[PDB]
């Protein structure tokens, strides 16, 4: 569980110290959701069959919709598709 | 790294077993079934009732249920030796697709029920069973080139 | 009954707690402006928030254990007479008006009068002392 906490913490304080490039912050926040699954999957492997790995397939299916709403909302961080502005 | 531990000893308080042999016992799987079935049932029953308390059915049933299977394989090694032998010889090819040797099955089963008078009672009443002569199914691909002459001769002589 | 405290034993550990708080927080406050530079000049911005933390423990808990040595037996009335000294370091925060530092001393004392232990427990039905037992009813 070193393997998941370290990638989670580095994604987290990458999301803190991110004074460049909004999308690197956005993908660090993405990689949090796979830093957490390396914790979850190895806890399930150290335990058993499907108890936590059900939550793992849930968080994968939902992390998809996370990135989908995040893109389709980042498109509207401005005007829409493109016009005159400043 | 799935390293192997291979320690050795022998423990006192019971008479030792006799082990069993390779994957060819899959051919003999039903053959130990109907004969050694109540031994099997009492073994697994005594295991399940002692909730967590394993390693106490070893001296009674862990010896007994292996004694029965050793007796069955000795009977089948004297009764139908080569009929067993060509049948598992078929059955080690074809991925143990147990459909894939269903003609030497009838030879071995006729030999067993002839001499050691057992059966293959697959429990369930609805369909037909082991004689199917498939007719819409997945019979075989390489039809046991050393064994087609055997069932052919059994159709011929018998 | 009670036990008098190790005044140095609380004091140096509390001063290290205050200095660690001045490192982890009073140097964390460097996000606030556009004067950038990282390490040598962070404490140019932040010399006036360090020892506001570290001096606070040396004001407070030193006074607290000394009050426990003077008015003993570990009462809450130490705290009101403790935290006033904390206001003295608050007085060192603003050397403008000594009337205002006496003001912040007495208000910090009244603040310290109450914060003895937040989230008290083991009081299943609270706030009902019971008298001597003679089949009591008017408590719980």
């Amino acid at each position: 569980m070193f393997i998941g906490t370290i990638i989670l913490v580095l994604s987290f304080l990458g999301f803190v110290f991110n004074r460049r490039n909004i999308i690197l912050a956005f993908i660090c926040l993405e990689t949090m959701l796979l830093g957490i699954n390396l914790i979850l999957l190895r806890n399930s492997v150290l335990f058993d069959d499907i108890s936590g790995s059900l939550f793992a397939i849930v968080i994968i299916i939902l992390a998809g919709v996370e990135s989908a709403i995040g893109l389709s909302l980042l498109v509207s961080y401005y005007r829409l598709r493109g016009v005159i502005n400043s | 790294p799935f390293e192997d531990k291979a320690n050795m000893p022998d423990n006192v308080p019971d008479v030792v077993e006799v082990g069993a042999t390779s994957a060819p016992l899959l051919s003999a799987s039903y053959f130990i079934g109907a004969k050694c079935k109540p031994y099997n049932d009492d073994f697994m029953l005594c295991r399940e009732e002692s909730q967590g308390s394993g390693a106490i059915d070893c001296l009674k049933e862990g010896r007994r249920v292996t004694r029965c299977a050793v007796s069955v394989i000795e009977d089948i090694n004297k009764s139908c030796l080569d009929e067993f032998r060509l049948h598992w010889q078929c059955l080690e090819q074809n991925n143990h697709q147990l459909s894939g040797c269903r003609k030497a099955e009838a030879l071995l089963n006729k030999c067993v029920f002839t001499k050691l008078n057992l059966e293959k009672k697959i429990p369930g009443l609805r369909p037909d069973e082991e004689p199917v002569f498939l007719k819409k199914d997945p019979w075989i691909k390489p039809a046991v080139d050393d064994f087609k002459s055997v069932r052919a001769y059994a159709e011929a002589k018998k | 009954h009670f036990h008098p405290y190790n005044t140095l034993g609380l004091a140096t550990q509390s001063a290290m707690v205050g200095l660690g708080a001045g490192v982890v927080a009073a140097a964390a406050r460097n996000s606030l402006a556009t004067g950038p530079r990282n390490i040598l000049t962070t404490f140019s911005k932040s010399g006036g928030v360090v020892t506001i933390f570290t001096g606070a423990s040396i004001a407070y808990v030193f006074t607290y254990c000394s009050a426990a040595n003077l008015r003993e037996r570990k009462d809450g009335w130490n705290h009101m007479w403790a935290g006033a000294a904390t206001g003295a370091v608050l007085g060192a925060r603003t050397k403008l008006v000594p009337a205002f530092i006496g003001w912040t001393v007495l208000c910090g004392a009244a603040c310290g009068l109450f914060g003895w232990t937040g989230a008290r427990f083991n009081a299943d039905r609270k706030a009902s002392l019971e008298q001597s037992p003679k089949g009591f009813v008017q408590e719980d």
Partner: protein, 452 residues
């Protein structure tokens, strides 16, 4: 019967001519009839508040949660009437936001909880920027999205550690485990602080507030109230940490001081945003309890009706300003509505009683919200937190009365010549009349929840 309503009216918004001001009348009347013919579950609700569980992971607590979803239906009917009578095609995701909120008020186990808090949060991210021809909403939605993502992985990391210490998931399996391994306590306060993203506890403070001022007013009514009740109703339904063991009390101390120290605000939206923040901070104090939910269940309704009311009143006060702000947001300054008592002063009376609500003068609300709050506090023994709650109430009352004192000074030049704008007036009159006549039936509820 919400899923059937959603799948019906997503098909109904499909193949629609983009009239899109009638479908909300159908959703309003549908939720009205659903409440009217689904209140019959209250008889089968409680003999002794007997819970009922869907498939082991979802819980139906018939006294608490069966009131919470009724409040959700009620305020949704009010919002749906507020959009009737400037819009885009959005009530599908209003209803699915409701579906997520009701799942988290029914979620026994963390898989359902996490799915539903994230569904709910996605709904908030979307509703923030449906009005996409803004520069306010464009910034606010992305800010809400990124921090909801952080707080989402904080949720999931709390529960993943919870799974790491115990191979179960359910809090039904916590079952007064009194050996209380310390990491169970730390996991649970981490899960608490994770769910407490929405209240904007004073270290997590400022970020919600710019979002509330950067949404249109027809939206910031909806998301200063839905997750405010939702995540806390989960948090009181299961009492995670019996006391705080000083972690949460510090959070509410710096909240209820350090969000009421946010006194001087000229923007209206900021002002009642801090109001809805600090009154949400109130009900965090009886998250610090055990076996106490009546004060919480009463304080939600006897806050949220009035929160809805003050937003509806400053909706009605757009008509009287002789200036407006941006296309999406009309009335952001306090000093816009100066001489309102020389306009239709009956709504000034309503605004008066709903702000005297929030300060808690006795005979309408505060002696029945804050009285139950304070008896729940002093039942436990949190003596200091009582007097800081009192200080919070006074200093909150100061910026509350700021609204009434700017409401009724004197008008420059406006009295009367107009047409009418009504038939939603019975909604605001219903909320104001239920605010200042609850002192009549303040004892019937005391018996009814004693029997549930």
């Amino acid at each position: 019967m919400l899923i059937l309503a959603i799948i019906s009216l997503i098909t109904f918004v499909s193949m629609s001519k983009l009239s899109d001001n009638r479908a909300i009348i159908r959703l309003i009347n549908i939720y009205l009839i659903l409440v009217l013919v689904l209140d019959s579950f209250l008889y089968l609700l409680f003999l002794n508040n007997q819970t009922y569980t869907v498939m082991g992971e979802l819980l139906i607590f018939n006294s608490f949660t069966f009131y919470i979803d009724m409040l959700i239906y009620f305020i949704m009917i009010v919002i749906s009437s507020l959009y009737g009578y400037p819009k885009k095609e959005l009530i599908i995701l209003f209803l699915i936001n409701i579906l997520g909120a009701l799942l988290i008020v029914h979620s026994n186990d963390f898989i359902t909880l996490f799915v539903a808090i994230e569904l709910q949060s996605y709904s908030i991210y979307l509703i923030t920027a449906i009005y996409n021809s803004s520069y306010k909403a464009s910034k606010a939605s992305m800010l809400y999205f990124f921090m909801g993502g952080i707080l989402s992985i904080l949720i999931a990391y709390s529960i993943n550690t919870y799974y790491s210490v115990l191979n179960s998931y359910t809090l039904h399996s916590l079952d007064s485990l009194i050996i209380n391994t310390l990491d169970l306590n730390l996991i649970l306060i981490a899960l608490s602080l994770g769910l407490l993203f929405k209240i904007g506890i004073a270290p997590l403070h400022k970020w919600l507030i710019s979002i509330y001022e950067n949404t249109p007013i027809l939206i910031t009514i909806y998301i200063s109230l839905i997750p405010k009740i939702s995540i806390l109703s989960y948090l009181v339904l299961s009492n995670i940490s019996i006391n705080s063991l000083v972690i949460s009390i510090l959070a509410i101390l710096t909240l209820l001081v350090g969000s009421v120290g946010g006194l001087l605000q000229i923007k209206i939206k900021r002002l009642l945003a801090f109001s809805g923040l600090t009154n949400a901070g109130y009900m965090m104090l009886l998250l610090l309890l055990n076996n106490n939910e009546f004060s919480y269940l009463y304080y939600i309704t006897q806050y949220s009706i009035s929160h809805l009311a003050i937003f509806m009143i400053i909706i009605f006060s757009i008509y009287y300003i002789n200036y407006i702000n941006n296309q999406y947001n009309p009335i952001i300054y306090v000093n816009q509505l100066k001489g309102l008592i020389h306009d239709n002063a009956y709504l000034v009376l309503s605004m008066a009683i709903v702000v005297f609500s929030f300060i808690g003068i006795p005979p309408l609300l505060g002696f029945f919200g804050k009285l139950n709050i304070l008896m729940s506090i002093l039942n436990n023994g949190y003596y200091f937190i009582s007097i800081v709650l009192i200080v919070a109430s006074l200093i909150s009352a100061l910026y509350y009365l700021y609204l009434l004192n700017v409401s009724i000074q004197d008008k420059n030049n406006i009295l009367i010549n107009s047409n009418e704008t009504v038939s939603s007036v019975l909604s605001y009159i219903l909320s104001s009349l239920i605010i200042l006549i609850t002192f009549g039936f303040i004892y019937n509820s005391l018996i009814i929840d004693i029997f549930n």
